[PDB]
């Protein structure tokens, strides 16, 4: 039923404080109410301290606020094998200690895809989960993007996370990679979008997932609901997050946009927190989570209009793939960030054939690096083998075929 969350890295923690804010905000639980259901990890004290000094100070247990004391290393191997290993136990312990207190469903991880402690580590975290709880490992990342990568090795770290992630990571919400910026440039206008601004966003789309949904409404949608109405196949399938009223709270004023507009503005190819433009990817299931003042007929019509746009081609084997989730309480925008603040929104997520891309583009990267072993000696020397790589590559391979077969046909 539940879904723990592990916010890792200063950022994953800033975004965390944010997503965590929106929550209580739409659940009527002020500063000091119940008890969260997540943890905070960082190897730089001063940042988690911000959660220990600033707002939402006493809404956490100094027990779900961890730090560390080792090296990150922008290399899979080290993070998965060698170093990352030492922590895992402890890590698990919480997702077994937090998983008990609640029949859970998984851990919403907040950090990023490609990286040192993001690729490697998780690889074995999701790894150790599929055997323990078999559960869900949806990691919400703030990464790229293809042509604008950061790390020099990135692909090495991606191809390795994909293969070992096939059974480890079910779905990675790959936002902030570089497509969320577009939204900050094109749908809000701002060239100076600090990492804090990008989080406020996911910090929003996420609030629409848990927060409000686990919150009463006219058409409730449980977490299980998702995976059920959202994954056609066991591959920890990765849908994409999208938000509708992403209008600027200063520029334009096209606020009053009837439900017959916010819905459609979630289909365009420039407002989905993911550089996976429906370049062909046939949707195969969408969970339209609405919140605010919405008449079920408005929806059971606005969606009807869509179902017949055809240029939005849904999979074949799927008659109807539209899970309409209606909540009451409208969204809740930061007092003075840059988010409009409408009285209704649409956080639609979905499995499009389309990550068929994102995975592809991330897999190819590994082949390029591995093809030369690049930073391989860094993992081998850390308790891994030509096996785990090559055999985790083959893994994702059938994730490129999977996300292809369940659609396009």
């Amino acid at each position: 039923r539940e879904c723990i969350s592990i916010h890792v890295g200063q950022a994953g923690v800033q975004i965390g404080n944010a997503c965590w804010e929106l929550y209580c905000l739409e659940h009527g639980i002020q500063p000091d109410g119940h008890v969260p259901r997540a943890v905070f990890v960082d190897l730089e004290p001063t940042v988690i301290d911000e959660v220990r000094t600033g707002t939402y100070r006493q809404l956490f247990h100094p027990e779900q606020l961890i730090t560390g004391k080792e090296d990150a290393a922008n290399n899979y191997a080290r993070g998965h094998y060698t170093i990352g290993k030492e922590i895992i136990d402890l890590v698990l312990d919480r997702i077994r200690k937090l998983a008990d207190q609640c029949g859970l469903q998984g851990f919403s991880v907040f950090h990023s895809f490609g990286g040192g402690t993001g690729s490697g580590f998780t690889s074995l975290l999701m790894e150790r989960l599929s055997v323990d709880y078999k559960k869900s490992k949806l990691e919400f990342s703030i990464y790229p993007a293809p042509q604008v990568s950061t790390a020099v090795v990135e692909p090495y770290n991606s191809i390795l996370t994909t293969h070992t992630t096939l059974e480890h990571s079910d779905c990675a919400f790959m936002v902030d990679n570089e497509a969320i910026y577009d939204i900050c440039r094109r749908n809000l206008d701002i060239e100076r979008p600090t990492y804090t601004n990008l989080n406020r966003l996911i910090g929003q789309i996420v609030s629409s997932i848990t927060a409000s949904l686990r919150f009463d409404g006219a058409l409730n949608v449980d977490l299980t609901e998702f995976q059920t109405n959202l994954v056609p196949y066991p591959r920890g399938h990765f849908p994409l997050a999208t938000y509708a009223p992403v209008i600027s709270a200063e520029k334009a004023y096209h606020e009053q946009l009837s439900v017959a507009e916010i819905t459609n503005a979630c289909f365009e190819p420039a407002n989905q927190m993911v550089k996976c433009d429906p370049r062909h990817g046939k949707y195969m299931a969408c969970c339209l989570l609405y919140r605010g003042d919405v008449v079920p007929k408005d929806v059971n019509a606005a969606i009807a209009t869509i179902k017949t746009k055809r240029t939005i081609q849904f999979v074949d084997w799927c008659p109807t793939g539209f899970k309409v989730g209606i909540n009451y309480e409208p969204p809740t925008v930061v007092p003075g960030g840059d988010l409009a603040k409408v009285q209704r929104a649409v956080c639609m997520l979905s499995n499009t054939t389309a990550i068929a891309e994102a995975w592809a583009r991330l897999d190819h990267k590994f082949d390029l690096m591995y093809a030369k072993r690049a930073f391989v000696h860094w993992y081998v020397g850390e308790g891994m083998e030509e096996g785990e790589f090559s055999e985790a590559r083959e893994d994702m391979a059938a994730l490129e075929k999977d996300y292809e077969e369940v659609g396009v046909d």
Binding site: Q10, E44, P45, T46, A72, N75, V148, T150, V152
Partner: protein, 411 residues
């Protein structure tokens, strides 16, 4: 994690004073005082450079090695000079023979060194910082590492230039740097003057300065990356992205905002201005000029809030305007790195760590000079006569020369 600085010689020492002058303020540590840190973050990771004894006295964990009292007695009698525990001050015929300081004379003094290099390591150790064509340099220092690497990394901050056998002492040490060291930020005394008298209208560039400039680069390298960043790296990344072939290869560090005080304070530091800087000939702490030979790798380790777009982008044009010299067998020579917090008082900087060339166009140089003079055993009697070997020089030149071949394997 941790590291233990090493102030070899006067220069390396003079610079120590500047590297620690800085770093401390970048960690709120007054002379003997403690952590006055404007913040609380400049403390959770200090350990990397200090030690806990009193409770207000975090003492720099470096070594001050020098055979000239007056020097360390100028560094210890001035400003921050009274923060180093006296134990830190480590004040035969030091023949100018690589084999004299690596096999015969140095080999003895080694054990009495490793002894301490362990006392300091066991002060988890990461590596040691080292600031500073001869005996005690190429031979004995090249041994110190071959031993260290059997026992943590080794960053070396060299002030590349003055001798006759030079290529002998050199070829032999580069060789060792292939299976020993693996991180040098080749800074320099006259490449500095220049870069310090024309890129800083500075008219009286005392040593302290040169040192200071150098220490500025070695801070951008290490310490820096041990900070957050949209895209951060660390010694290894730097190593695993910069060394195509095992020789060890030597780099040439370059700082970003290098503008004269008052006037110049142009702030033209949007970013194209930093790459403008870093990638020009002058401004390379090395003596040689990049424009005289391709690159194998480059690592712009920036440290100041910027767009992963205007960074990742610039790097490109740069890679295309100069396709000529940038070697081809590496689609993306450049290794963009990006910290967040910048040099204390500055808005935006970016350390440059360039790897010379694959048609190794520097080790080539060195290696050439050797042979041209080795062939005639030029000033070889000063080496052998110091207990060296005719096979020692052969070794180095061969080992060091090979590095150029391997490095080309990627160009």
């Amino acid at each position: 994690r941790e590291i233990v600085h090493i102030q070899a010689g006067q220069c390396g020492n003079q610079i120590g004073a500047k590297f620690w002058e800085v770093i401390s303020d970048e960690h709120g540590i007054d002379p003997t005082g403690s952590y006055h840190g404007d913040s609380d973050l400049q403390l959770e990771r200090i350990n990397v450079y200090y030690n806990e004894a009193a409770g207000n006295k975090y003492v720099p964990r470096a070594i001050l090695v020098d055979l000239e009292p007056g020097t360390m007695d100028s560094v210890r009698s001035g400003p921050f000079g009274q923060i180093f525990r006296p134990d830190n001050f480590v004040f035969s015929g030091a023949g100018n023979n690589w084999a004299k300081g690596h096999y015969t004379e140095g080999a003895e003094l080694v054990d009495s060194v490793l002894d301490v290099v362990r006392k300091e390591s066991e002060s988890c150790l990461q590596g040691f910082q080292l600031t500073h064509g001869g005996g005690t340099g190429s031979g004995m220092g090249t041994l110190l590492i071959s031993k260290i690497r059997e026992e943590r990394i080794m960053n070396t901050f060299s002030v590349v230039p003055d001798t006759v056998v030079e290529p002998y002492n050199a070829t032999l040490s580069v060789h060792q740097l292939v299976e020993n060291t693996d991180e040098t930020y080749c800074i320099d005394n006259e490449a500095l003057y220049d870069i310090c008298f024309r890129t800083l209208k500075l008219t009286t560039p005392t040593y302290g300065d040169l040192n200071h400039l150098v220490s500025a680069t070695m801070s951008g390298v290490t310490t820096c990356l041990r900070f957050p960043g949209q895209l951060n790296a660390d010694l290894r990344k730097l190593a695993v992205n910069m060394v195509p072939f095992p020789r060890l290869h030597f780099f040439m560090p370059g700082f970003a905002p290098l503008t004269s005080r008052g006037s110049q304070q142009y702030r033209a530091l949007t970013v194209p201005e930093l790459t403008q800087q870093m990638f020009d000939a002058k401004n390379m702490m090395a003596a040689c000029d990049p424009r005289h030979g391709r690159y194998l790798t480059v690592a712009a380790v920036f440290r100041g809030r910027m767009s992963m777009k205007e960074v990742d982008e610039q790097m490109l044009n740069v890679q295309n305007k100069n396709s000529s010299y940038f070697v081809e067998w590496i689609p993306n020579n450049v290794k963009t790195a990006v910290c967040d917090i910048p040099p204390r008082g500055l808005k935006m900087s970016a350390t440059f760590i360039g790897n010379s060339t694959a048609i190794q166009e520097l080790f080539k140089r060195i290696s050439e000079q050797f042979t041209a003079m080795f062939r005639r055993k030029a000033f070889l009697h000063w080496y052998t006569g110091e207990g060296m070997d005719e096979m020692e020089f052969t070794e180095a030149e061969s080992n060091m020369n090979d590095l150029v071949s391997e490095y080309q394997q990627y160009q």
